Amino acid sequence: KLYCICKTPYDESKFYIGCDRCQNWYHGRCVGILQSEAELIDEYVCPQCQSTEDAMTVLTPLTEKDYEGLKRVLRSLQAHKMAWPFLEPVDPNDAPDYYGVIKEPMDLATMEERVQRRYYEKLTEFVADMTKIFDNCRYYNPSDSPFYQCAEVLESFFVQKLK
Amino acid sequence: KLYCICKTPYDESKFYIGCDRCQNWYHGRCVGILQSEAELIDEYVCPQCQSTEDAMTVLTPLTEKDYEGLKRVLRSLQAHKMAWPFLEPVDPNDAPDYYGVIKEPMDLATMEERVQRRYYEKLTEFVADMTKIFDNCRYYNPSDSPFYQCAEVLESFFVQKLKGFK
Ligand SMILES: [Zn+2]
Ligand SMILES: [Zn+2]
Ligand SMILES: [Zn+2]
Ligand SMILES: [Zn+2]
């Protein structure tokens, strides 16, 4: 029976904190929780359990309520002052080779269509589409391009809105 | 500072259990308590404090509840087969020299009356009177006398009856 992150036999003399979920025990030192602090918590959830929980959270089927959130985030990007180049599909007149270089184009108008028809089933998929907009930009344009830089800024804004 | 019986600096990585009475912290193993056992208890009294509580039982004030117990203990003694010689005060006619040799006579009837009079305030005082009965008998009679043996038997019965009194 190996307990804790350190995977060691139980030592009757050491201080441990239990995780109800997985029923494992952790040396307060291994998870960095002082005994005084341990008393301040009612239901401790170990790191592994918390990680798995979050991983499962972002993959959970989206609910109508969840969509209120996706709509908000999408609208915030569309309203961003520097988001004008991604509101609609790239126009060849501005970049003749674009659609030959970018195999999976994406834009905010298309994401809006997909949001409306509830095309996304998990938060991960919605995030994938948005990331695609930024990745395509950084891929097509050189790093010293204002557009490449804009993609950088907008993605950080996106990550913040998601938090 | 220094904690536990082992008098050592507090170690954040060690399991400790605290005493409700003295508020000192002790390594579980040092006081004979496993963690699994610790979780099953609300309160905890360390060995030292328990030792003090055990000792002070005879010194604390006697409560109404304790007095019930005094009556119970006394009744068990009065009903004991070996208590026949201590149920009442010695009659001078049966032993002319008795009250001249025994300085502090005592008997179960007198003790029953003292309980009725609420004369005792500490268990130790009740035990002292009981002990007069036995010591007096063993002083006045030879060891091979049935009287002496009755005292020996009743005193060991009494000592047992006293366990867990309060
Ligand atoms: Zn560990
Ligand atoms: Zn866990
Ligand atoms: Zn104590
Ligand atoms: Zn110790």
Element at A17 (helix H, strand E): strand A16-19
Nearest CA in chain B to A15: B15
Same domain for B86 and B140? yes
Name residue B102's amino acid.
Answer: I
Instruction: Please tell me if residue B25 touches chain A, with a CB cutoff of 8 Å.
Output: no
Tokens of B99: 């009250």
Residues of A in contact with B13 (CB under 8 A): 14-15, 27-29
> What technique solved it?
X-ray
Element at A16 (helix H, strand E): strand A16-19
Same domain for B45 and B88? no
Q: Kindly give the distance from the C-alpha atom of residue B6 to the centroid of ligand 1, in angstroms, as a whole number.
A: 25
- Which among B113, B122, B12, B116 is positioned nearest to B57, based on CA atoms? B122
Element at B6 (helix H, strand E): none
Residue owning tokens 């099953």: B40
CA A45, CA A23: separation in Å to the nearest integer?
10
Q: Angle at Cα A153 formed by Cα A151 and Cα A159, nearest 5°?
A: 100
Same domain for B47 and B100? no
Number of domains in chain A: 2
Residues 6+ apart with CB under 8 A from A130: A77, A106, A111, A158
10 Å CB burial of residue A97 (0-12, 13-18, 19+) is exposed
Same domain for A33 and A87? no
Same domain for B74 and B145? yes
- Which among B39, B45, B55 is positioned nearest to B24, based on CA atoms? B45
Residues of B in contact with A28 (CB under 8 A): 12-13
Domain containing B82 equals 57-166
CA B36, CA A136: separation in Å to the nearest integer?
58
Resolution of this entry, Å: 2.0
CATH number at residue A46: 3.30.40.10
